[PDB]
Amino acid sequence: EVLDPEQNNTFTDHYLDVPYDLSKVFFITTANTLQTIPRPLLDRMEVIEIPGYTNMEKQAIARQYLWPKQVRE
Amino acid sequence: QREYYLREQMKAIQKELGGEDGLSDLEALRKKIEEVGMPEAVKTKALKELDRLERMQQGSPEATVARTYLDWLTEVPWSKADPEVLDINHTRQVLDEDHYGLKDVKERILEYLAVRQLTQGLDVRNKAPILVLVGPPGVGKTSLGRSIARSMNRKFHRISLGGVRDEAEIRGHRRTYIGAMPGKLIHAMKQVGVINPVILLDEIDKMSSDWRGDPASAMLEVLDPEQNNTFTDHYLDVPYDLSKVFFITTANTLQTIPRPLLDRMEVIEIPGYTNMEKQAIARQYLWPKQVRE
Amino acid sequence: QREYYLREQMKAIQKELGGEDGLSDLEALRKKIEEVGMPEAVKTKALKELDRLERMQQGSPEATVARTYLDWLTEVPWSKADPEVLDINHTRQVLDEDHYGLKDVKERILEYLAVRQLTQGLDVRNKAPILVLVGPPGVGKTSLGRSIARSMNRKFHRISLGGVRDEAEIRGHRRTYIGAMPGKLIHAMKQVGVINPVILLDEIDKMSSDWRGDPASAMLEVLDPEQNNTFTDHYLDVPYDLSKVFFITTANTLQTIPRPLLDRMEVIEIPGYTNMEKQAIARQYLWPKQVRESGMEGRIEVTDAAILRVISEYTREAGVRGLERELGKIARKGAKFWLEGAWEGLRTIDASDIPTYLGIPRYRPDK
Amino acid sequence: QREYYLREQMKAIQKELGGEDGLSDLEALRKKIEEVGMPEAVKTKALKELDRLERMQQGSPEATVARTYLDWLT
Amino acid sequence: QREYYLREQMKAIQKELGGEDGLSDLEALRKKIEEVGMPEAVKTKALKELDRLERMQQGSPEATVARTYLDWLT
Ligand SMILES: Nc1ncnc2c1ncn2[C@@H]1O[C@H](COP(=O)(O)OP(=O)(O)OP(O)(O)=S)[C@@H](O)[C@H]1O
Ligand SMILES: Nc1ncnc2c1ncn2[C@@H]1O[C@H](COP(=O)(O)OP(=O)(O)OP(O)(O)=S)[C@@H](O)[C@H]1O
């Protein structure tokens, strides 16, 4: 009910007996596999797969982000 | 002369300690009970508990309980209804404006209207359908409910039963308790103004069911096609008829519905679309929507 | 002190509602208490609570509690019963008008009536059996309650126990609370006017438990025929007799009924219907009521072979809700065909015209 | 009579703290219930709950539920 | 003497707001304890939970708990 992209204009919990509007809120959900998400819940979300890094972009991350941070701390 | 002079004295005592109520709106409740619906046993017990509020004094914490019971009892509709639409062609037009395909559901609605045309007063039973729409996760069977409700010129209200686990959400709590009020059905019948709504029960196959909470066995006598004209709440203790309510329920599978609840409902399969149907849906419903937005 | 003075004059006016408030109380209820006919200990408790409903003033929150407890104690039936039937042939003829088949249940009811009519002098008898109807969904369990109650010329009341979780529905709350109502059983006894109704307790196998106990423990008190003659709720502080009530209960399976309840019950199983039984109850019961409700009577009919087609090739069940949904579908299609051009007389639906009305068959017959 | 005068004194204290302040509670909630941009179908429920609240007892076990509900709405 | 003097005052007040001995309680269920059993520790405990029902309000929930307790212990 909270992630339905057509019907979350009217979300109703049990304490507030009124419909509340959740259509403007930017949801970002995080997972690490898709197999344990039930199929009606997976259909409501847009998938973006982040694959894992190669060695030269690991070098770029280590030069530009990780090593100055570990030096300052 | 003497008895209405006695009324003059009690009026003097009342308005010198008047609350702008206690004689200003108790008799408004007296007028409002008698003018709206309310079969005879209900109005007898209602006037019985109306004449035993007047000697509470608000300054009576049980005066709140009785007045809120009366205001749940008078604002739930009794015999107020929307007419049936006779233009079956106009209903066909409005159903074709919203969705592509889906001939089975549309023919079900048009046959309901054809039956309601041939009964223009015959003293027969008027029993509204109880449906379950079953299909794959993407096929539109939630938007179809309010498309039906707009095409028939009826009122619409949606209830989500997706994670509901307690029985106090279908029926209420008793009037004894501090903050009690009825279940979602009586509240939905109060939000809607009539006795002919289209109530979408959003997913009927996802209710929790164990030895510590099973609402799926309290949905029996809500969806019973023979006995839901005497549905009894726990807050209201009068029998209240739900036999005129057009209930549409939705599910993705039939295996997780309890078997005494499944055969209460007429099952309409919605199978999933072919490539020509998806091309037509994409041409005249989805692409103009995305281009506008 | 002004407002004390003012409703002091109001209660002095209440001494002269009609020249007195007595007719509404000491003379309302003192007339109503022996107008009914009530036992002696409850008469003692009623008189020596009207003794202090006498003394107090109206309006104050200690008089409304006592007055509602006196009003609820006056309108519960004490020693008033419907007459007993002495002709079991009339009971057999009434039971055969509402249902078809179901021979063992009907003859068990006739055995109970014969036992109670032959035995009215030894005073161990006349404990009514706690009947349990067990079967698949769709067989006539719930309808037999009203059919049996019409057969014995008694009054009927149905209580649904499908999702009852609180124990305060069976046995109520004490009348010292700010809101106070009795249980559902004594409310049902107020609904009927007699001491011997037929109470249908529907779906006893589906009661839910909670903390503060489960309502099966409170249900065991009323449904045990050796302790239900002194049944005590908490609203009424007195024992009440519920031994003359004929209880009928329904269930779908036995494995979820509590063990101290199954030891006091006599199960009667309803097996499910064969095809000849299904077409008999479709000729006699389902098809006329599906044609009346469509407004198509005198305009469309169906043969026996067509009903056998509908049973064999479109249903797989034990009950008959699906069969009447199919017959209602045929009546709807006829009602829609009527509006797009009428006919005279009545057309008769044959077994070769069924796929026009119901579509492609969904089960294949054996050959 | 002494403690009657005591409770009557403290009731006189609470009905005017500074100049007024006796009714800053429900009148401030009446202001706040219309300063926010609620839909009308929620405003009707809120005003009916507040009118049902204003007859009650200040400090009842049945008043704090309604006041907490109105606070969650505001 | 002081027992039936102060209870004589109990009687003389309860006679008009109660029409003579009220409820048959409060003097002779005091005598029903000595005619059944009992160990003396049980007897003094019964007298202690008996004498707390003396002035406590009739129509209150705690009194009924104490009432059924001393009636079932009897
Ligand atoms: N035939 C159709 N014509 C037009 N729009 C359609 C059609 N079928 C589906 N849609 C659209 O598809 C979307 C999904 O509809 P939903 O009713 O939400 O599907 P749903 O089956 O109810 O999802 P769940 O997971 O089963 S609750 C909606 O925006 C519909 O408008
Ligand atoms: N032998 C029969 N003769 C006539 N009508 C019957 C017969 N058996 C069943 N029916 C009808 O079948 C319908 C279903 O009856 P019910 O008693 O409500 O079923 P049920 O056994 O109570 O089902 P559940 O799921 O346990 S509530 C009613 O309309 C009955 O009139």
UniProtKB/TrEMBL annotation, chain C:
Binding residues for ATP: G135, P136, P137, G138, V139, G140, K141, T142
Residues that coordinate or bind ADP 10: H99, T142, R321
Residues annotated as binding ADP 7: H99, K141, T142, S143, R158, Y273, R321, E324
One of the record's GO molecular function terms: sequence-specific DNA binding
Sequence positions that bind ADP 4: H99, Y100, G138, V139, G140, K141, T142, S143, Y273, K289, R321, E324
Positions contributing to ADP 1 binding: Y100, G138, K141, T142, S143, Y273
Protein localization: Cytoplasm
Induction notes from the record: By heat shock.
Chain positions recorded as ADP 2 binding sites: H99, Y100, G101, K141, T142, R146, Y273, K289, R321
Binding annotation for ADP 8: H99, K141, T142, S143, Y273
Chain sites annotated for binding ADP 9: H99, T142, R158, Y273
Binding site for ADP 3: H99, Y100, G138, V139, G140, K141, T142, S143, R146, Y273, K289, R321, E324
UniProt main location, coarse: cytoplasm
Residues the entry annotates as binding ADP 15: Y100, T142, Y273, R321
GO BP annotations, alphabetical order: cellular response to heat; protein quality control for misfolded or incompletely synthesized proteins
GO cellular component assignments: cytoplasm
Family classification: Belongs to the peptidase S16 family.
Protein name, entry field: Lon protease
Organism: Meiothermus taiwanensis
Gene this chain is encoded by: lonA1
Full-sequence portion shown in this chain: 221 to 587 of 793
